[PDB]
């Protein structure tokens, strides 16, 4: 019984850790992807600016 | 009170209160019913998404424009678009605001009469006035003469004006416009392997056309250069990945404007219908029209068109006249800016078609003195 209680508690703690880590990963992923899209957009508008310079 | 300067257009509805610099709400004019079945219950699924909402759910809709070539082919959808424009994009009830619609030249009468009948019966405005889309674009340039080429998305028309006196016998209306260029681009993209068929993917091809295509200064030299080097191939990322590379399709899509034989149209390009429109005018105002050629409308935003057109007209015109092409940076909203200026004038305040006048003469009042 003692081993069972300790094991179950350790398991539950680790499980909740797992869930929270997943949520953190998701949020950081969303922010990083938004930054990535921002970077692609800035580079593309930069190139458009370069081509505008080429025009004039 | 303030006037509502609406501008139906064909492809983008531009609206806003009179007296500002830019339209308040600009959104595509498409009404798309859902086409699949739908299994989630209580999701709050509507029966028709209009305006900019249907450009985000376009994956499961069948978008269909209610205005084909200037004329309106589906009156219920157009009424829905107007209702959305008034109530959700501006949030001003029409019972307390005059309206100033715009209409292409040489359009069917029934279209204009139905438009005024709707505005007076359904929305119940105090007074509405219909104006030709080119005179406004001439207002916005601050000129009073000049020949304006308003190449919209539905129809390209070329109205010459001198000293405020329009020349009704010299209006050359041509039905090639941005939509036909989108279809032709979608048709020539198939030469590399990319097939766009669905009415939703027409929007993707339109975005490709807007972001990549440009008008070549000299067509044959560009065709020769793109066939030897690879300095032109610009890539573009679809809404799901799988980047595509556009080669000499870049300047072949908008070249259709100057050679309408590409899409099988007989008529001459926009470079020669302007010269023909000038030559129909009197012999003493041709110099002023040559010097004050005005560009407007969305489709005239291609990078490098204000030079190609000037080169072509200089080739056609006599060598002594000076050819100048006015291309303001605010080309897209030029018609609406002109509409705002016209609605803000004090001299114009008595030209509106007041409701009591409509009640006495019926919808045919628009063709009468109140034009």
């Amino acid at each position: 019984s003692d081993k069972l209680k300790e094991a179950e508690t350790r398991a539950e703690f680790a499980e909740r850790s797992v869930t929270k880590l997943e949520k953190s990963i998701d949020d950081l992923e969303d922010e990083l992807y938004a930054q990535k899209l921002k970077y692609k957009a800035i580079s593309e508008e930069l190139d458009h600016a370069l081509n505008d310079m080429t025009s004039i | 009170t303030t006037a509502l300067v609406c501008d139906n257009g064909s492809g983008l509805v531009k609206a806003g209160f009179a007296g500002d610099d830019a339209p308040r709400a600009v959104f595509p004019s498409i009404v798309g019913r859902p086409r699949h079945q739908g299994v989630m219950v209580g999701m709050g699924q509507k029966d028709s998404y209009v305006g900019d909402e249907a450009q985000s759910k376009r994956g499961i809709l069948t978008l269909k424009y209610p205005i084909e070539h200037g004329i309106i082919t589906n009156w219920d959808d157009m009424e829905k678009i107007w209702h959305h424009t008034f109530y959700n994009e501006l949030r001003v009830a029409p019972e307390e605001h005059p309206t100033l619609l715009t209409e292409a030249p040489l359009n069917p009468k029934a279209n204009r009469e139905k438009m005024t009948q709707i505005m007076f019966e359904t929305f119940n405005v105090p007074a509405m006035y219909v104006a030709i889309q080119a005179v406004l674009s001439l207002y916005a340039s601050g000129r009073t003469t000049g020949i304006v080429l308003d190449s919209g998305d539905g129809v390209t028309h070329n109205v010459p004006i001198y000293e405020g006196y329009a020349l009704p016998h010299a209006i050359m209306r041509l039905d090639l416009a941005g939509r036909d260029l989108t279809d032709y681009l979608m048709k020539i993209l198939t030469e590399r392997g990319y097939s766009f068929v669905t009415t939703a993917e027409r929007e993707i091809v339109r975005d490709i056309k807007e972001k990549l295509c440009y008008v070549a200064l000299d067509f044959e030299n560009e065709m020769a250069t793109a066939a030897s080097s690879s300095s032109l191939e610009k890539s573009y990322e679809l809404p799901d990945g799988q980047v595509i590379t556009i080669g000499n399709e870049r300047f072949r899509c908008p070249e259709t404007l100057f050679q309408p034989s590409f899409i099988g149209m007989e008529s001459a390009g926009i470079h020669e219908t302007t010269y023909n429109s000038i030559m129909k005018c009197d012999i003493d105002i041709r110099k002023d029209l040559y010097a004050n050629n005005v560009l407007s409308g969305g489709t005239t935003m291609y990078p490098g068109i204000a030079d190609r057109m000037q080169k072509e007209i200089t080739a056609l015109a006599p060598s002594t006249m000076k050819i100048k092409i006015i291309a303001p940076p605010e080309r897209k909203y030029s018609v609406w800016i002109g509409g705002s200026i016209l609605a803000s004038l004090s001299t114009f305040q008595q030209m509106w078609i007041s409701k009591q006048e409509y009640d006495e003469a019926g919808p045919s009042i628009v063709h009468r003195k109140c034009f």
Binding site: - | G142, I341, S346, T347, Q350
Partner: protein, 77 residues
């Protein structure tokens, strides 16, 4: 008959100044101000915050290494 516009007084081509010259300077100055404030708010704060998060990440790495090692030491049987 074609419509006849009643005669007024004035003007035209005189609002081009009052709608152009305004934004010719005000818009440029305001956009420069916006760019300056946005860069100041964004870039330095983002780099500093990323450095802070990196330091916290290194501390988490040290804690993970210590815990993993002590548990492997005990459990090794």
């Amino acid at each position: 008959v074609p419509p006849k516009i009643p005669d007024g007084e004035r003007v035209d081509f005189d609002d081009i100044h009052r709608k152009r010259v305004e934004k010719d300077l005000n818009e440029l100055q305001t956009l420069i101000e916006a760019h300056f404030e946005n860069r100041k708010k964004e870039e330095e704060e983002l780099i500093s915050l990323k450095d802070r998060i990196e330091k916290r990440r290194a501390e988490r790495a040290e804690q993970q290494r210590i815990r993993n090692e002590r548990e492997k030491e005990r459990q090794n049987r």
